[PDB]
Symmetry: C2
Subunit: 192 residues, 2 copies
């Protein structure tokens, strides 16, 4: 299980914490002496760096695709799952963002579009296949106000393909040259 040299429960009061390019420390309930926000932001940056590294090891990548730096220079949104009732905290994350994609269609019509993309997604190995990925995915869909078949996925893994099929009945449609994956229903003339 993952761990940091600072109080993650204080930093992240909610079970799922949303962060964007501002990397803004969550507000806390009044009363406690809160560290300086600059220092809280460095804690968040270290968490994102380490989560990105862990995801890269899980995915057999030579370099992370998620980092604090890349958060600050992009318009990515990360959702970080803690357990507040852990004994004796951070479980994983999902990172999304809108991307311009020059997408190939199936009747062969081809074009541009900017869907919300699933960019990185990781649940710690020890608690994979327990339902944490689904909780995190569900929360992200609700906040982004997106439906599953509207997504594009950047280079999904085998585990993720199975996940998407199980939870959302997502079936792949036309392969795409750009290595993003889209599903039946992505195009308006498709069903589901």
């Amino acid at each position: 299980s993952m761990e940091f040299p600072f109080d993650v429960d204080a930093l992240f009061p909610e079970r799922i914490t949303v962060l964007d390019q501002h990397l803004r420390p969550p507000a806390r309930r009044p009363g406690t002496t809160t560290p300086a926000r600059v220092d809280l932001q460095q804690q968040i940056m270290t968490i994102i760096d380490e989560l990105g590294k862990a995801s890269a090891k899980a995915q057999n990548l030579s370099a992370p695709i998620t980092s604090a730096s890349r958060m600050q220079s992009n318009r990515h949104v990360v959702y970080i799952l803690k357990d507040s009732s852990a004994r004796p905290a951070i479980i994983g994350f999902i990172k999304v963002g809108y991307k311009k994609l020059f997408v190939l269609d199936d009747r062969e019509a081809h074009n541009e579009v900017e869907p919300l993309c699933i960019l990185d997604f990781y649940i710690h190995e020890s608690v994979q296949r327990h339902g944490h990925g689904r909780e995190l995915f569900q929360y992200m869909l609700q906040k982004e106000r997106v439906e599953p078949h509207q997504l594009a996925i950047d280079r999904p893994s085998q585990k993720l393909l199975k996940f998407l099929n199980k939870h959302y009945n997502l079936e792949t449609t036309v392969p795409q040259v750009n290595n993003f994956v889209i599903f039946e229903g992505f195009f308006a003339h498709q069903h589901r």
Copy 2:
């Protein structure tokens, strides 16, 4: 945790079970009514098939690299780790075999050789990073009568590269065109 529709503790009495192309059922202590060996062998084949599929999902491969069929047609040896004291069994495996490799050296001498190769290796996600991989690797080295720096690795993952460096001080040497990895000391003129 992994699970099968038959008694793995009866099938595999030892914590680490070695199997080769014969896929021979382990002998048991006298007394129990043992199923027919053909049926025990089918149980073993199903275990190897499922372990290979799990390893392929872990590794983001489109197809397994380990299967009962491929065991029977190759000269591969698999070491399967159970826990006999599990509550309320199979943890993972390592697969090895000798392979002819047309290896590129570092003073640029180049040639043929047939080292023992690490071909597949998987510990269930739930108990990765607990020391199970090391126990299994240690047992395999002792049985094969091989030293770590004598090995070649078929397409090691990032996790495995870190593992080998931690436990055995293995540092990569000349990259190889064949996608196998070898370490300093593989060649007789190298140290360690």
